[PDB]
Amino acid sequence: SALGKLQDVVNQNAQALNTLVKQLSSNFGAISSVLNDILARLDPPEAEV
Amino acid sequence: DSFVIRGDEVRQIAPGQTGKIADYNYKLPDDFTGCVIAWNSNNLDSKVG
C-alpha cells in the first residue's frame, strides 16, 4: 500500500471507463439494448421512439 | 391530395401507419404536418352494378 495514490487514480479511471462501456448494455426502458435488434425488429415510426 | 378509398382504410391515411395503400399507393412521412379529411361518398361514388 505504499503506492496507493497512483493505483487509486488508475483504478478510478479504469472503473469509470468500465462503467461507461457497461452502460451500453442497459436498454433504459426500451425493448432491447441493441440498436440492430430494434432496427431489424420494428418499423421506423416505433424504432424512432 | 384527393383520392377515394375503402371505409376501413381511412385509418391508414396517417403518419406512421402500417397498411397496404400506405406502402404501395400513398405514403405519408413521419414528420408530416397537415390534416386528413375523410367523408362517406356512397351516394355518389357507388353503383348498384
PDB file of C-alpha atoms in Angstrom:
ATOM      1  CA  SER A   1       0.000   0.000   0.000  1.00  0.00           C
ATOM      2  CA  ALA A   2       2.979   2.348  -0.429  1.00  0.00           C
ATOM      3  CA  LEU A   3       1.888   3.334  -3.956  1.00  0.00           C
ATOM      4  CA  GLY A   4      -1.839   3.515  -3.215  1.00  0.00           C
ATOM      5  CA  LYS A   5      -2.384   7.049  -4.540  1.00  0.00           C
ATOM      6  CA  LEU A   6      -1.324   6.232  -8.114  1.00  0.00           C
ATOM      7  CA  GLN A   7      -3.114   2.882  -8.066  1.00  0.00           C
ATOM      8  CA  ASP A   8      -6.197   4.728  -6.786  1.00  0.00           C
ATOM      9  CA  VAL A   9      -6.090   7.100  -9.774  1.00  0.00           C
ATOM     10  CA  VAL A  10      -5.583   4.206 -12.223  1.00  0.00           C
ATOM     11  CA  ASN A  11      -8.419   2.202 -10.632  1.00  0.00           C
ATOM     12  CA  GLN A  12     -10.795   5.182 -10.687  1.00  0.00           C
ATOM     13  CA  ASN A  13     -10.121   5.902 -14.370  1.00  0.00           C
ATOM     14  CA  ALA A  14     -10.441   2.231 -15.364  1.00  0.00           C
ATOM     15  CA  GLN A  15     -13.640   1.861 -13.323  1.00  0.00           C
ATOM     16  CA  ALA A  16     -15.121   4.961 -14.981  1.00  0.00           C
ATOM     17  CA  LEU A  17     -14.306   3.545 -18.428  1.00  0.00           C
ATOM     18  CA  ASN A  18     -15.774   0.156 -17.469  1.00  0.00           C
ATOM     19  CA  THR A  19     -18.973   1.803 -16.208  1.00  0.00           C
ATOM     20  CA  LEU A  20     -19.279   3.889 -19.392  1.00  0.00           C
ATOM     21  CA  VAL A  21     -18.874   0.796 -21.582  1.00  0.00           C
ATOM     22  CA  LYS A  22     -21.247  -1.194 -19.326  1.00  0.00           C
ATOM     23  CA  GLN A  23     -23.989   1.445 -19.667  1.00  0.00           C
ATOM     24  CA  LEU A  24     -24.401   0.459 -23.342  1.00  0.00           C
ATOM     25  CA  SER A  25     -25.800  -2.901 -22.187  1.00  0.00           C
ATOM     26  CA  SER A  26     -28.764  -1.183 -20.497  1.00  0.00           C
ATOM     27  CA  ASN A  27     -31.943  -0.740 -22.518  1.00  0.00           C
ATOM     28  CA  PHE A  28     -33.182   2.307 -20.496  1.00  0.00           C
ATOM     29  CA  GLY A  29     -36.790   1.162 -20.770  1.00  0.00           C
ATOM     30  CA  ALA A  30     -36.626   0.128 -24.426  1.00  0.00           C
ATOM     31  CA  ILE A  31     -37.342  -3.401 -25.641  1.00  0.00           C
ATOM     32  CA  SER A  32     -33.635  -4.094 -26.231  1.00  0.00           C
ATOM     33  CA  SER A  33     -30.238  -2.518 -25.655  1.00  0.00           C
ATOM     34  CA  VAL A  34     -29.021  -3.458 -29.157  1.00  0.00           C
ATOM     35  CA  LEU A  35     -29.664  -0.917 -31.910  1.00  0.00           C
ATOM     36  CA  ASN A  36     -29.500  -3.571 -34.646  1.00  0.00           C
ATOM     37  CA  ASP A  37     -32.193  -5.667 -32.933  1.00  0.00           C
ATOM     38  CA  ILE A  38     -34.553  -2.677 -32.742  1.00  0.00           C
ATOM     39  CA  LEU A  39     -33.836  -1.689 -36.351  1.00  0.00           C
ATOM     40  CA  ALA A  40     -34.404  -5.268 -37.554  1.00  0.00           C
ATOM     41  CA  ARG A  41     -37.493  -5.978 -35.419  1.00  0.00           C
ATOM     42  CA  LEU A  42     -39.551  -2.779 -35.624  1.00  0.00           C
ATOM     43  CA  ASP A  43     -40.738  -0.310 -38.221  1.00  0.00           C
ATOM     44  CA  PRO A  44     -39.070   3.177 -38.219  1.00  0.00           C
ATOM     45  CA  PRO A  45     -42.054   5.006 -36.558  1.00  0.00           C
ATOM     46  CA  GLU A  46     -41.708   2.974 -33.338  1.00  0.00           C
ATOM     47  CA  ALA A  47     -37.994   2.269 -33.783  1.00  0.00           C
ATOM     48  CA  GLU A  48     -37.516   6.052 -33.694  1.00  0.00           C
ATOM     49  CA  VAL A  49     -39.070   6.090 -30.204  1.00  0.00           C
TER      50      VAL A  49
ATOM     51  CA  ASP B   1     -54.125  15.084 -52.293  1.00  0.00           C
ATOM     52  CA  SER B   2     -57.521  13.733 -53.339  1.00  0.00           C
ATOM     53  CA  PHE B   3     -58.410  10.053 -53.684  1.00  0.00           C
ATOM     54  CA  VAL B   4     -61.153   7.517 -52.932  1.00  0.00           C
ATOM     55  CA  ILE B   5     -60.509   4.543 -50.631  1.00  0.00           C
ATOM     56  CA  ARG B   6     -62.385   1.960 -48.569  1.00  0.00           C
ATOM     57  CA  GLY B   7     -64.098   2.563 -45.245  1.00  0.00           C
ATOM     58  CA  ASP B   8     -61.537   0.581 -43.253  1.00  0.00           C
ATOM     59  CA  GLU B   9     -58.538   2.170 -44.993  1.00  0.00           C
ATOM     60  CA  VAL B  10     -59.178   5.688 -43.651  1.00  0.00           C
ATOM     61  CA  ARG B  11     -57.043   4.849 -40.609  1.00  0.00           C
ATOM     62  CA  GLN B  12     -54.082   4.196 -42.933  1.00  0.00           C
ATOM     63  CA  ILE B  13     -54.047   7.784 -44.267  1.00  0.00           C
ATOM     64  CA  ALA B  14     -51.948   8.912 -41.311  1.00  0.00           C
ATOM     65  CA  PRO B  15     -48.254   9.240 -40.441  1.00  0.00           C
ATOM     66  CA  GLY B  16     -46.621   6.083 -39.149  1.00  0.00           C
ATOM     67  CA  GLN B  17     -49.361   3.660 -40.198  1.00  0.00           C
ATOM     68  CA  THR B  18     -48.835   0.091 -41.375  1.00  0.00           C
ATOM     69  CA  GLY B  19     -51.061  -0.928 -44.253  1.00  0.00           C
ATOM     70  CA  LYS B  20     -51.441  -1.809 -47.906  1.00  0.00           C
ATOM     71  CA  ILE B  21     -52.261   1.528 -49.548  1.00  0.00           C
ATOM     72  CA  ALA B  22     -49.797   3.123 -47.118  1.00  0.00           C
ATOM     73  CA  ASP B  23     -46.963   1.094 -48.652  1.00  0.00           C
ATOM     74  CA  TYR B  24     -47.964   0.775 -52.322  1.00  0.00           C
ATOM     75  CA  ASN B  25     -50.389   3.646 -53.030  1.00  0.00           C
ATOM     76  CA  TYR B  26     -49.926   6.701 -50.787  1.00  0.00           C
ATOM     77  CA  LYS B  27     -47.209   7.124 -48.152  1.00  0.00           C
ATOM     78  CA  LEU B  28     -47.078   9.885 -45.534  1.00  0.00           C
ATOM     79  CA  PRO B  29     -43.797  10.957 -43.886  1.00  0.00           C
ATOM     80  CA  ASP B  30     -43.191  10.530 -40.168  1.00  0.00           C
ATOM     81  CA  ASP B  31     -42.839  14.319 -39.729  1.00  0.00           C
ATOM     82  CA  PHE B  32     -45.985  15.098 -41.743  1.00  0.00           C
ATOM     83  CA  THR B  33     -47.888  18.285 -40.931  1.00  0.00           C
ATOM     84  CA  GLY B  34     -51.392  18.970 -42.182  1.00  0.00           C
ATOM     85  CA  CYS B  35     -54.873  17.493 -41.989  1.00  0.00           C
ATOM     86  CA  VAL B  36     -56.524  14.351 -43.360  1.00  0.00           C
ATOM     87  CA  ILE B  37     -60.181  14.759 -44.355  1.00  0.00           C
ATOM     88  CA  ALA B  38     -62.466  11.798 -44.998  1.00  0.00           C
ATOM     89  CA  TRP B  39     -66.172  11.643 -45.730  1.00  0.00           C
ATOM     90  CA  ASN B  40     -68.590   8.977 -46.922  1.00  0.00           C
ATOM     91  CA  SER B  41     -69.464   9.058 -50.626  1.00  0.00           C
ATOM     92  CA  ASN B  42     -71.760   6.046 -51.010  1.00  0.00           C
ATOM     93  CA  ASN B  43     -74.448   8.190 -52.657  1.00  0.00           C
ATOM     94  CA  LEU B  44     -72.098   9.433 -55.403  1.00  0.00           C
ATOM     95  CA  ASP B  45     -69.142   7.042 -55.829  1.00  0.00           C
ATOM     96  CA  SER B  46     -71.122   3.781 -55.887  1.00  0.00           C
ATOM     97  CA  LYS B  47     -73.290   1.943 -58.402  1.00  0.00           C
ATOM     98  CA  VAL B  48     -75.697  -0.967 -57.979  1.00  0.00           C
ATOM     99  CA  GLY B  49     -73.890  -2.915 -60.717  1.00  0.00           C
TER     100      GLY B  49
END
